[PDB]
RNA sequence: UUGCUCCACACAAUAUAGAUGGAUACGAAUAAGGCGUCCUUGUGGCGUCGCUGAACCAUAGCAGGCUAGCAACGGUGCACUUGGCGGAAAGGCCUUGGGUGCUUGCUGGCGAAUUGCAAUGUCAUUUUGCGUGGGGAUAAAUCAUUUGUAUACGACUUAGA
RNA sequence: GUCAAGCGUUCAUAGCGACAUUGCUUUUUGAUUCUUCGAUGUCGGCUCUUCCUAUCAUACCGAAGCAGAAUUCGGUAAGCG
């Protein structure tokens, strides 16, 4: 069809810096800073007032309009991620085998190591991704709380957690067991 | 001065042909900054000379000429069409040639 | 087709001694030139009516101009084809300037949507929308809007040599 | 603390928008678009210049910087009234744009002795610029 | 209309390219092509990726020595699309083929002199934007190139002295030109507008 | 039986995938940049440019002679020199200073003809050779003999004043 | 391969699948006598190399009427047996 003009809207609260040069979007605030490099998408940002930053298309088919809504929704996420911030909660699932997961160090990279895992000797090993911090919670039995700026460095090193602790030959309809998230939200909220 | 050109730059480029049947009495050349075949009925008649180099001495010279003349302009580019007394040897393929202002008209 | 022209023509059906002055039927028929228009009415009459050109007169060929060529006119063609596996009806809206550059844009459209080729194809009607609401397609209610504005990004100029010493840009 | 969002500026099919034309019987005339017809193609008018009125391509056209009040839809006489009212063609004729097509049409109009008569002044020229690189 | 015609292969397109400079070298025209490793293809890099793969895989069988030679340099991917454009096989083809040069990066003497572009090959004229192309750099590196590191490290240390070159050709270009425009309003540069110069 | 190489200029032969003013150097982006400028030195403000190199530089003089001055202290060529930078294939780029011409920036004086109405009308750059007068240098390999870490033969690997 | 009446304790499609229907192979077996009668040495074996994938095993997976063990259906895959 070939829209004429696709738009979308970007809120700038009161304490966040937006900056976009060519395609490039940093987004600071009280949490720290942001960067995205947007240049595979060919989309025009525009700055209305201050508060708000809108995003448009000029004779965009479908999958380019498709892709402008996934642009308003990044910056956002970047936007959430440095005024309130990216929480996710995992819990540990086991029948039998306690999973005993502990902050390690390995080489100044910062790992996370996964013993005992279905009674494994094998120890599984996840590297943190910088901005993520991993928590252990108190008060609540076998939870790990990952937090950070990026909801994709968080999701992803939550992603990678859960990945490596899957069930090898048995069926998992029974073999319930590893890391699964519970909770996807913020640092800042109430 | 330093430029003594009284002549516009060619290219001999090839012989009139099908896909696999060259006629080499008409050759194709390129005269440069000719695009169009508009452009190119200025040089329509204009005297062509391939120049070029001897080893065999023959009338107190080592340079040795072919002469010819454009006839008709060849494609939509600024080609033309050019015949030879006698026909470009087609090693001369690429070689230049020297398409001078002579007979004028403006 | 390089523009197709709108004529009129009119037949007849051959007077007969039973019957003087039979009853001139009347088409308007989108064609190049008017060799392909009275083909075009002899072919249509023998879907309508018992008449061919063996037995038939052509009384008035009339290419017919549009009244305002300037003016930007929303379009509204009803058009039935044949495609590979049937007949189908179908309505399509068309922006222009004039009847017989609406009927370019069809033809060519329903060539590039449909693979319809000029012998598959029937203009049943071009009437040109009067109101703006009536305009059914979103397509070319797009351009309708109040203080309608557009750019034209990423600008690809033309060159005439085979080089260029610049890197040139796209800004426009 | 100011958002630093960058203009990405456009010249826009616009009714009012003053045009060049590049391809056609015109071929270096102005005109300014009266209605949008569709993506590519305009309603394009230059009442001053004598270009007739057409539904032109924008592929034969090059916006230009210019726009001027002109309302939807206007005919050939409204737009000249807004065009002269507006005063185009001495905002057109201010701009480095056309002074170098108008140079170009200058330079090559030149006559074999005014090609020698701008080798002998730009030698003088030159006389004078490289004297004043040397001195500062 | 250079002797030689110095082509910056950044951002072309590889056939596009090659049916340009094929033409220009049986025409009789010298061109070195330069900075090899980032031409541009069309297509995603899987999608090209699968065509060497298809490519190296056929050699003869007898033989693996005489069969296609699959030369992996992203010069030689662009020297194998000029060639088959040329007629390679014969004395005229052979001898268009010595006009050319191709390199990777900018070595000398090519590092201080002029390159052109080719618009009729340029990716960002000729492909849609939205589109998905791949760099031969990244693309020969996976087919077996083993210098895009060491010419890489080359171009960086290329563009850091190019870039003085430019700084300095930048300060000589505001006192050449502050000079002409002061030069200008004087009686010569008022004649010399009149004859349009 | 004065052999070899380098430097310069003197002449022969050799040819030419094709001189005929100049290959005239940022990088990156292209839904963005370039240049100028300002400050708080930024993913900054302001101005301005593109819409092609249709540019820019060069460019006048018996293929460019001989000669007179005016202005300015500029431009350019050749040879020496000074210092720096360049290893991707550097083999070039930028400098200091003197000598040496030329200068059409400006104004003069003399020459040109008969190549006869046009004939590339010969002006380039390679290889070599011979000659001159200036510098430099003062070996190896192979056969034949030998070894057996080698080997069909060659080849290999060793040894011998 | 599609469709799904039914089988599969209920439940068409975990695994199956009638009556129909649409294709693939040239390694099975059938049709031309196209080439060979101034002769292309006729089967099997041994030896030895390479190729295909329509995958038996091995690597990694998805599904189950997969609790485990063992199976079965399916994917990438001819690298290696
Ligand atoms: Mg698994
Ligand atoms: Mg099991
Ligand atoms: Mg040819
Ligand atoms: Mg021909
Ligand atoms: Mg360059
Ligand atoms: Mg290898
Ligand atoms: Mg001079
Ligand atoms: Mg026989
Ligand atoms: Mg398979
Ligand atoms: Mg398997
Ligand atoms: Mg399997
Ligand atoms: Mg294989
Ligand atoms: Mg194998």
Redesign the pocket.
């Known amino acids: 069809m070939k829209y004429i003009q696709t738009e979308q809207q970007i809120e700038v609260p009161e304490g966040v810096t937006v900056?976009?040069?060519?395609?490039?979007?940093?987004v600071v605030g009280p949490r720290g800073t942001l960067?995205k490099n947007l240049?595979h998408?060919?989309?025009?940002?525009t700055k209305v007032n201050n508060q708000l930053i809108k995003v448009?298309?000029?004779?965009?088919g479908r999958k380019?309009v498709a892709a402008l809504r996934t642009v308003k929704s990044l910056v956002d996420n970047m936007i959430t991620g440095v005024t309130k911030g990216y929480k996710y909660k995992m819990r540990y699932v086991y029948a039998h085998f306690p999973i005993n997961v502990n902050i390690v160090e390995k080489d100044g990279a910062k790992f996370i190591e996964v013993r005992n895992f279905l009674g494994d000797k094998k120890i599984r090993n996840v590297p943190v991704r910088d901005g993520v911090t991993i928590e252990f919670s108190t008060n609540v039995k076998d939870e790990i709380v990952l937090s950070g700026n990026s909801v994709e460095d968080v999701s992803q090193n939550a992603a990678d957690l859960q990945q490596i602790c899957?069930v090898?030959?048995?069926?998992?309809?029974?073999?319930l067991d590893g890391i699964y998230v519970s909770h996807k939200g913020f640092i800042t909220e109430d | 001065?330093?430029?003594?050109?009284?002549?516009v730059?060619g290219k001999?480029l090839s012989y009139q042909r099908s896909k696999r049947v060259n006629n080499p009495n008409v050759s194709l050349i390129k005269i440069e900054?000719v695009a169009t075949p508009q452009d190119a009925q200025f040089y329509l008649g204009k005297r062509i000379?391939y120049?070029?180099?001897?080893?065999?001495?023959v009338?107190?010279?080592?340079?040795?000429?072919m002469?010819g003349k454009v006839t008709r302009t060849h494609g939509n580019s600024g080609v033309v069409r050019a015949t030879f007394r006698n026909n470009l040897?087609?090693?001369?393929?690429?070689?230049?040639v020297?398409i001078?202002l002579?007979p004028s008209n403006i | 087709m390089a523009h197709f022209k709108e004529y009129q023509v009119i037949g007849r059906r051959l007077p007969t001694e039973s019957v003087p002055e039979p009853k001139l039927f009347r088409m308007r028929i989108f064609a190049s030139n008017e060799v392909i228009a009275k083909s075009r009415y002899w072919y249509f009459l023998q879907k309508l009516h018992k008449v061919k050109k063996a037995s038939g007169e052509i009384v008035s060929i009339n290419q017919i101009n549009e009244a305002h060529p300037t003016k930007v006119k929303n379009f509204g063609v009803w058009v039935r084809y044949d495609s590979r596996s049937g007949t189908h009806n179908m309505y399509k809206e068309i922006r222009d300037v004039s009847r017989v550059a609406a009927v370019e844009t069809l033809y060519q459209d329903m060539a590039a949507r449909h693979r319809a080729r000029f012998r598959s194809i029937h203009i049943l009607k071009v009437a040109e929308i009067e109101k703006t609401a009536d305009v059914k397609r979103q397509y070319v209610k797009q351009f309708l809007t109040k203080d309608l504005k557009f750019p034209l990004?990423?600008?690809v100029?033309?060159?005439?040599?085979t080089?260029?010493?610049?890197?040139?840009?796209?800004?426009? | 603390t100011?958002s630093?969002?960058?203009?990405?500026?456009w010249r826009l099919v616009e009714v009012g928008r003053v045009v060049?034309i590049?391809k056609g019987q015109s071929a270096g005339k102005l005109a300014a678009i009266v209605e949008i017809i569709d993506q590519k193609k305009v309603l394009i008018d230059g009442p001053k210049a004598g270009v007739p009125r057409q539904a032109i391509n924008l592929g034969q056209v090059?916006?230009?910087?210019l726009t001027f009040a002109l309302p939807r839809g206007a005919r050939t006489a409204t737009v000249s009234k807004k065009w002269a009212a507006a005063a185009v063609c001495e905002k057109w004729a201010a701009?480095?744009?056309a002074?170098?097509?108008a140079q170009?049409?200058r330079?090559?109009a030149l006559t074999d002795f005014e090609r020698?008569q701008?080798?002998?002044l730009?030698?003088?020229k030159?006389?004078?610029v490289?004297?004043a690189?040397?001195?500062a | 209309?250079?002797?030689?015609?110095?082509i910056?292969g950044?951002?072309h397109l590889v056939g596009r390219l090659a049916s340009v400079v094929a033409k220009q070298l049986l025409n009789?025209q010298?061109i070195?092509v330069?900075?090899a490793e980032?031409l541009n293809i069309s297509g995603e890099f899987f999608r090209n990726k699968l065509k060497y793969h298809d490519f190296l895989?056929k050699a003869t069988?007898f033989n693996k020595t005489r069969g296609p030679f699959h030369f992996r340099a992203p010069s030689r991917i662009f020297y194998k699309a000029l060639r088959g454009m040329v007629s390679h096989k014969?004395?005229?083809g052979?001898?268009?083929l010595?006009?050319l040069k191709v390199?990777?990066?900018?070595?000398?003497?090519?590092?201080?002199?002029?390159?052109v572009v080719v618009?009729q090959a340029?990716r960002?004229?000729r492909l849609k934007?939205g589109r998905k192309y791949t760099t031969l750099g990244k693309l020969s590196t996976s087919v077996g190139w083993k210098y895009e590191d060491?010419?890489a490290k080359?171009?960086a240390?290329?563009?850091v002295?190019?870039?003085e070159?430019?700084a300095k050709?930048?300060?000589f270009?505001?006192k050449v030109?502050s000079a002409?425009a002061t030069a200008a309003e004087s009686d010569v540069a008022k004649q010399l507008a009149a004859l349009g110069?």
């Open positions: 900056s976009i040069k060519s395609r490039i979007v940093k960067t240049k998408i060919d989309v025009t940002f448009a298309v000029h004779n965009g380019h899957r090898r030959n048995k069926d998992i309809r029974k073999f | 001065a330093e430029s003594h050109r009284l002549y730059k001999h900054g000379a120049v070029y180099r001897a080893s065999k001495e009338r107190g010279s080592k340079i040795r000429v002469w040897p087609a090693k001369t393929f690429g070689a230049s020297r001078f002579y | 990004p990423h600008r100029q033309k060159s005439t040599k080089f260029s010493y610049k890197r040139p840009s796209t800004f426009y | 100011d630093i969002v960058k203009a990405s500026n060049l590049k090059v916006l230009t910087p701009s480095s744009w002074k170098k097509i170009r049409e330079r090559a020698f701008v080798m002998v730009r030698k003088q030159r006389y004078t490289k004297k690189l040397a001195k | 209309v250079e002797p030689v015609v110095v910056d950044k951002g009789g010298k070195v330069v900075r980032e895989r069988a014969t004395a005229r052979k001898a268009a010595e006009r390199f990777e990066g900018i070595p000398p003497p090519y590092d201080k002199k002029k390159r618009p340029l960002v004229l934007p060491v010419v080359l171009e240390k290329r563009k002295s190019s870039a070159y430019y050709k930048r300060a270009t505001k030109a002409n110069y």
